[PDB]
Amino acid sequence: GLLQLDKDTFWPYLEQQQDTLVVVDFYTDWCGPCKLIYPELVKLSQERTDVRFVKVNCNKSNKELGMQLAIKVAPTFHLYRNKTKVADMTGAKMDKLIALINQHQPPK
């Protein structure tokens, strides 16, 4: 399972991850497609151990984080380096995600 971040741990996590690529899966409890893509995401995370995969439940508890990050679509994916968003995409499109990741952190 992917490491879960919250409104109080999100930015401290990105602060301490230096410039390693961080892939954030923003999901919700009502998001069908999120449940469809999740086992593939876990799979990818075990293969690409050079990239960080984490997840954020956009809910009322985390509502300030979702507003601050301007989350619109469930799921949304952000890629981060050095505390800074280098890409994003929406929807459960694992093909597109893998291509986005390889364009920022090519394997091997």
Numbering used by the authors: 72 to 179
What does the paper say about this structure?
Thioredoxins (TRXs) are small oxidoreductases of 10–16 kDa exhibiting a characteristic three dimensional structure classified as TRX fold, composed of a single canonical globular domain comprising a mixed β-sheet surrounded by four α-helices.
The crystal structure of CrTRXf2 was solved at 2.01 Å resolution. The overall structure is a flattened spheroid of 49 Å equatorial diameter and 25 Å polar diameter, and conforms to the classical TRX fold. In CrTRXf2, the first active site Cys (hereafter referred to as CysN) is located at position 38 at the N-terminal kinked tip of α-helix 2. The second catalytic Cys (hereafter referred to as CysC) is located at position 41, and it belongs to the same α-helix 2. In the CrTRXf2 structure, the catalytic Cys are covalently disulfide-bonded in accordance with the non-reducing conditions of the purification and crystallization procedures. Trp37, Gly39, Pro40, and Lys42 of the conserved 37WCGPCK42 motif arch over the disulfide bond, leaving two gates to interact with the solvent. In our structure, Cys65 is likely in the thiol form, since its side chain points inward to a hydrophobic pocket formed by Phe33, Val63 and Ile78. Detailed comparative analysis of the crystal structures of CrTRXf2 with other TRXs revealed that the f-type specifically (i) forms a rougher surface with larger cavities, (ii) orients a crown of electropositive patches on the two opposite sides of the active site disulfide, and (iii) adopts a local flexible hinge downstream of α helix 1. These specific structural features of CrTRXf2 should guide the recognition of specific targets by facilitating target space accommodation, flexibility, and electrostatic interactions.
